[PDB]
């Protein structure tokens, strides 16, 4: 951060450089983890089961939780720091009520010097107002940095106990729900790389007449033969977002887990 | 901390730097732990077994317990070096009767002084009075912090008396109790992490063919087989808040202990 | 980065110094990867079954995104540093529009000192000219560096739902492919070296009388026996982009892997 | 570098030490290799086979391309550095239309001052032509040398577009085939060495009666027993350039491949 000293421009780089990075940390956020994509292919073809996406809450909750534990804990740094609108509420003091401070201000030659106070443009003239310039942009913005770490905790505090309220569940079914869905999604991935390989290693030896395996991936065509064989419907049914229903007894946790039951 | 220097928004930083972030450090310490939750699921459905949470005093004493232990020493480290209400009683003191300090204060240029004490915008003329404000600040600013431990110690010593009044049984039995709940909970998120994984690779294992265990993963589906048929009532019969009642003769120590005596 | 002084030829060093080592870099991004040749071999013959390069979106698509990830980085490095146009915004700044600025800017004498500001060849009679030329430079450079980075975000953004959208599989199928063909063509590459030392080792030892070997390659002819018998043809039949595909129940993954299901 | 400073010679450094230097790392580039020494073996007496080194296209492109990473790497260091041209542009600076620059050239006394500028021959009054040569010399010299790299690079790109137009085969057999030349120019020079040792260990023996071999010596005259007999002609048909053809059916990797179809 490194503030100008204009009007016309100046209260832009307030509003923007706290608010505009924060931002784009909060696209990248949505972008690079996994768990937003279960929405985007369960409304491409969603295969014609539930619409308006209305048992997905914890699924939008979870995906805005993670793209907003980057760009607020930014946009504190940014606040508590202090340098947030420093050009940019100069240009909204006004020139007689800025009290606590002898106005060096003119009819005429006010308003630039309002938009140039801390590009370190202003002469040593103003030193009372340097007592008055560190009096409104470090108190207030450092306010505002304590109090959106409160307007974040209180949404916390609501939209915890808004889904205590809205769920079939417990407390305690819902902590190991989540520890069977990271335990079964840690298992697909470590197994379909393991499938993958041992499906392009049959694939390369029937072109030269074998293969170039370390000891360990031998062991492992050893334990592990396949055939790829699953078609692109048993890919379809158990993608999807969430399926919480109950096999008339019995819970079910995963997309994967209703189909696992139809055998 | 860095206080301003101007009236009607100075006598507000001190109150507020003082207290709001306790404030806020006080609800991030109700939500970041465990145990109020069970409050909040007893109220929500509560199965119509108990009303108005009455003997959840053991309850709301320990959630506030771990809720004051982050703030209260956040606020007298706010308190014992001083800077709380620096600019703030500035606003209050007395232009006449601030005695030891030979009074610079004309009738209509007073106050404004009054407002810009501790923001280095006090002139050398007032270098009696960096003696008179080092001596209210420093002074009843350090009292103030040692007697909130005062208080706090005062109502500790309180509370603890009283719940050794309201309390059904002894303190080595209440010792006890203490040392069986965190041996419960242990041993439950341990027991549902390793029940989650082994309902995993049951599934993965349908799809695919096999799975791609560690070998430590190995032999805990070799000891720990599982197939997932605990229904949502035998979820919730071991949910809640606390359970100390009697078996006839017999104490029983928490909501899952009351479940596997129906057995 | 060190930008000149004087007109007709200020100007063309803000966008080139920013905007051309970016192009030369995106170009060496295509040249050194892997991937591209593929549509290079399937548009030079072609073997006459696949025109206009249509289902290549998700091969053009990954030939850019590792050609942009190199000059993209280079270009906001050198964007938010700030250098990017120091000599080249200052022949469009306004001679008597320039404001906040006191303009020592004659009819005849002007433009030459606004074609000489960041080459510390301005005088010291321009210093409220530095207030305003680190005003306009370091502010719009900056902000546009976080913007490049927003118009990155959102196009990747962009093009991340349109691909879910023109795919026929899923994407967890779509993780699935992707880890087949990094195992493909690390055990073709890497069995490709095996066998081309088997071939030459037993032409020098048909020249000889004997081969050099080390100890791993002694047991590495002991294992894996060759005569290199695979016509030019049976390269052709491999080497191609993609090729999903369905053989009538079952996916085919890669080109190679149509092959080896004729056998 | 270090440039001179007068006329009729001072032109003279800027290209040489530019380009000079360069053009001899070239030659040692040519010299210093392996693999020029084919085309000049294959036209000495070349066998009446082929002519006009017709198929040698990717020869030619080869032994260009490590005679090109050399000299163009200095070449732009000798150009990114900005000290190419110093004193050489210097002696075409226009005496009237060095415009940015106040003029300190008379009618006679003007040519001799532009041929000793960076010779830190210039004095004090010339410190507006310091802002003047740090312009020319350090914008035009950094720009060239990013434009070069983006020669070199278009010229690549452009070349390994024609090498996959003028090729029999695909690229996966030529990422092949240059595994294979590399295995076996390591395995003939390593055989060639222990073949060489064996038969100079028994003409020592046959002159003293023994020899003084290591202990990896000895047992490298029991596996590896040797009377050399392969004559001039057998070691004139595995020499020249390359040879792609076909056995009918077959691929030919090398000179010595088609040798040893040949038993």
Redesign the interface.
Known sequence: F????????NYL?GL??IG??A??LF??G??LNNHT?NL??EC?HRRTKNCSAAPTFLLLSSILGRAAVAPVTWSVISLLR?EAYVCALSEFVDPSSL???EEHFPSAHAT?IL??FP???NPDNLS?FR??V???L??ES??FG??L??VV??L??LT??LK??CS??????E??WA??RA??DQ???????????V??????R????????NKDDEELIA??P?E?????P???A??GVYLYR?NQ???L??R??K??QG?
Chains 1, 2, 3, 4 share one sequence.
């Open positions: 490194h503030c100008p000293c204009s009007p016309a421009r780089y923007a450089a505009v990075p931002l784009v696209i990248i949505i972008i994509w985007v292919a491409q202090g009290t606590a401070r630039e938009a140039r590009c370190k443009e009372d007592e008055e560190s009096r409104r470090r108190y450092q306010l304590w109090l770490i409160g905790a209180i916390v505090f915890k106990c205590h309220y079939p569940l417990s407390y305690r079914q902590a190991y520890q069977y335990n079964e298992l697909f991935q470590r197994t379909a790389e393991v499938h993958s390989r499906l392009a290693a049959n694939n390369v029937r072109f030269f007449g074998f293969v170039a395996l334990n592990f396949v790829g064989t699953q078609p692109r048993q890919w379809n158990i993608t109950e007894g019995l819970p946790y995963s994967l887990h189909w696992a055998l």
